[PDB]
Design an enzyme around this catalytic site. Sequence first.
Site, mmCIF file in Angstrom:
data_model
loop_
_atom_site.group_PDB
_atom_site.id
_atom_site.type_symbol
_atom_site.label_atom_id
_atom_site.label_comp_id
_atom_site.label_asym_id
_atom_site.label_seq_id
_atom_site.Cartn_x
_atom_site.Cartn_y
_atom_site.Cartn_z
ATOM 1 N N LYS A 71 0.899 -1.128 0.000
ATOM 2 C CA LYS A 71 0.000 0.000 0.000
ATOM 3 C C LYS A 71 0.957 1.201 0.000
ATOM 4 O O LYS A 71 1.893 1.243 0.806
ATOM 5 C CB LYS A 71 -0.899 -0.001 1.233
ATOM 6 N N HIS B 77 -13.373 6.249 5.919
ATOM 7 C CA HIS B 77 -12.271 6.492 5.034
ATOM 8 C C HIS B 77 -11.444 7.620 5.582
ATOM 9 O O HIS B 77 -11.991 8.565 6.112
ATOM 10 C CB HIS B 77 -12.823 6.848 3.643
ATOM 11 N N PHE B 78 -10.146 7.494 5.455
ATOM 12 C CA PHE B 78 -9.248 8.534 5.912
ATOM 13 C C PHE B 78 -8.932 9.435 4.740
ATOM 14 O O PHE B 78 -8.363 8.993 3.770
ATOM 15 C CB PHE B 78 -7.990 7.895 6.458
ATOM 16 N N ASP B 79 -9.342 10.688 4.796
ATOM 17 C CA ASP B 79 -9.130 11.592 3.691
ATOM 18 C C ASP B 79 -7.780 12.281 3.674
ATOM 19 O O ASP B 79 -7.086 12.338 2.681
ATOM 20 C CB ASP B 79 -10.258 12.640 3.673
#
Length: 124
Positions: free
Chosen positions: A41, A119-121
């Site tokens: 990732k 979700h991590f923005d």
Amino acid sequence: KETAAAAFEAQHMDSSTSAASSSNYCNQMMKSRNLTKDRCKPVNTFVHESLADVQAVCSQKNVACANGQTNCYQSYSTMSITDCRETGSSKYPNCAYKTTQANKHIIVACEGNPYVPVHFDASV
């Protein structure tokens, strides 16, 4: 098969430490969380706060998400976070990351009922 909420916790929650131990933190964590299993990732942020505190962000400052959606929230205060970013050299399956510890505000997208982070923005 894991809910988005659950996936959020697995990828970004690290309440066991108040901060990144060493420069090797990312290397270790990305592995531990199985984030380098199929590929590396490229980027990921770990939050060193309680789950409760992170979840509470969904009731804090509403802002736009990067994708233009509006179910994003910015934390009122700064939080302890560790930014992980894959190095130029890193090639699967030998994933390597640069660890950057900091205190910043986080922005997450919330959803559901209960309305939790999915979700991590970004960090700011």
